[PDB]
Design a protein around this ligand. Structure first.
Ligand SMILES: CCNC(=O)c1cc2c(N[C@H](c3ccc4c(c3)S(=O)(=O)CCC4)C3CC3)ncnc2[nH]1
Length: 168
């Protein structure tokens, strides 16, 4: 477990790689994989959809049962559930969707959830269709997370732009 390889070291506790989070979870077998979730845990597309399809829908079925009894999460909040075949646990974290008018300040709260786990495999929160500035999301991660985080960014151009910007 936690056999991470090929990552660029940004800080003593933040690492980054141009990779698909699904393929990283299969090779690494991490203790925790982070899902970029929405408050009702509907894993239809993007990172959430990719993780769910890689569990052959077991993640969505588990999430629907959680929602039925507990209700939706809050933006900036999180929920630990099974990681199924991809990891021991899945930490479902809700980052702000700035394309839907949600507060970017809550991105700090979203990353604070990582501090409860010694090591995690994660996507860059609120990137993609959530519309947050990816350079800013990396800065919030670096300034907030104290535990070991391995960021998988599935876009070579975005990866190159983030590394170049961080090295300034
Ligand atoms: C082939 C199956 N895998 C995938 O489709 C996949 C997609 C993917 C990925 N996408 C990034 C990303 C990061 C955060 C968020 C999104 C998307 S979202 O559009 O889902 C909205 C929620 C926040 C994207 C490059 C910035 N990052 C790592 N591993 C991946 N794997």
């Amino acid at each position: 477990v936690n056999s991470f390889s090929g990552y660029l070291k940004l800080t003593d506790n933040v690492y980054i790689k141009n990779a698909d989070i699904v393929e990283e979870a299969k090779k690494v077998k991490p203790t925790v994989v982070v899902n970029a979730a929405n408050v009702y845990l509907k894993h239809g597309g993007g990172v959430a959809g990719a993780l769910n399809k890689a569990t052959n829908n077991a993640m969505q079925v588990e999430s629907d049962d959680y929602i039925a009894t507990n209700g939706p999460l809050k933006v900036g909040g999180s929920c630990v559930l099974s990681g199924h075949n991809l990891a021991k646990h899945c930490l479902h974290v809700v980052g702000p969707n700035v394309n839907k008018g949600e507060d970017i300040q809550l991105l700090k709260s979203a990353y604070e959830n990582f501090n409860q786990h010694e090591v995690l495999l994660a996507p860059l929160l609120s990137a993609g269709i959530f519309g947050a500035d990816p350079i800013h999301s990396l800065r919030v991660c670096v300034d907030t997370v104290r535990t070991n985080v391995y960021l998988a960014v599935f876009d070579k151009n975005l990866y190159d732009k983030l590394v170049s910007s961080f090295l300034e």
